[PDB]
Amino acid sequence: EPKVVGVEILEKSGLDIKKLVDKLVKATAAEFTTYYYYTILRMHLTGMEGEGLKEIAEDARLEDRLHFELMTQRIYELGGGLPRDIRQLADISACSDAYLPENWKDPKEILKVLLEAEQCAIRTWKEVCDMTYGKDPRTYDLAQRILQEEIEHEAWFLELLYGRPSGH
């Protein structure tokens, strides 16, 4: 088999690459399911109450799809892969399925689901940062970038649900 120096420099640090890839896959799986589940959640932000909220949920959805594309590349660079079956992907997702709630006509119910998904993502990508910190500059940078946007996403929904200031 071939010498992969991009991997060797990580192994020298004592980094467990199988464990890292496994965490990346679960985190990345959650991004893909988010892209699906946030589609439905955005659709159901209806009425005059929910109208302005759609574009905030839309932004999060599209940015999370790009988080999937971003970290997928890295998984393969490290010698890992995505699950063969899409159902496997759903089952190993780092996060709980962001289902449409029962009383979805109250947009706060939708916002709670979005908020919980984002909070899970924050914990998930923060764990990846802690592992790659001081060992894997490439993975750390990508994971830090993603984490940075999840923090923003949580801040958006916190501002809508509660009266908590954040951004724009």
For residue 152, say whether it is annotated as part of any ligand binding site. no
Within residues 49-68, the interface with its own copies by CB under 8 A covers: 49-56, 58
Tell me: does residue 71 bind its own copies (CB under 8 A).
Answer: no
Tell me: does residue 96 bind its own copies (CB under 8 A).
Answer: no
Tell me: does residue 154 bind Zn ion (CB under 5 A).
Answer: no
Q: How many chain residues are in contact with its own copies, going by CB under 8 A?
A: 77
Q: Return the residue of 81, 109, 110, 114 that touches its own copies, per CB under 8 A.
A: 81
| 143: Cβ contacts below 8 Å, ≥ 6 apart | 27, 71, 125, 128, 129, 132
Q: How far apart are CA 118 and CA 111, in angstroms?
A: 10
**Count of alpha carbons within 13 angstroms of residue 160, beta-carbon side:** 27
The structure tokens listed for 167 are 């951004």
CB 35 within 8 A of CB 96: no
| 151: Cβ contacts below 8 Å, ≥ 6 apart | 122
CB-wise, 64 or 136, nearer to Fe ion? 64
In the complex, minimum distance from the CB of residue 28 to Zn ion, in angstroms, rounded to a whole number: 9
What is the contact surface with Fe ion in residues (CB under 5 A)? Answer: 60, 64, 118, 121, 150, 153
What is the contact surface with Zn ion in residues (CB under 5 A)? Answer: 31, 64, 67
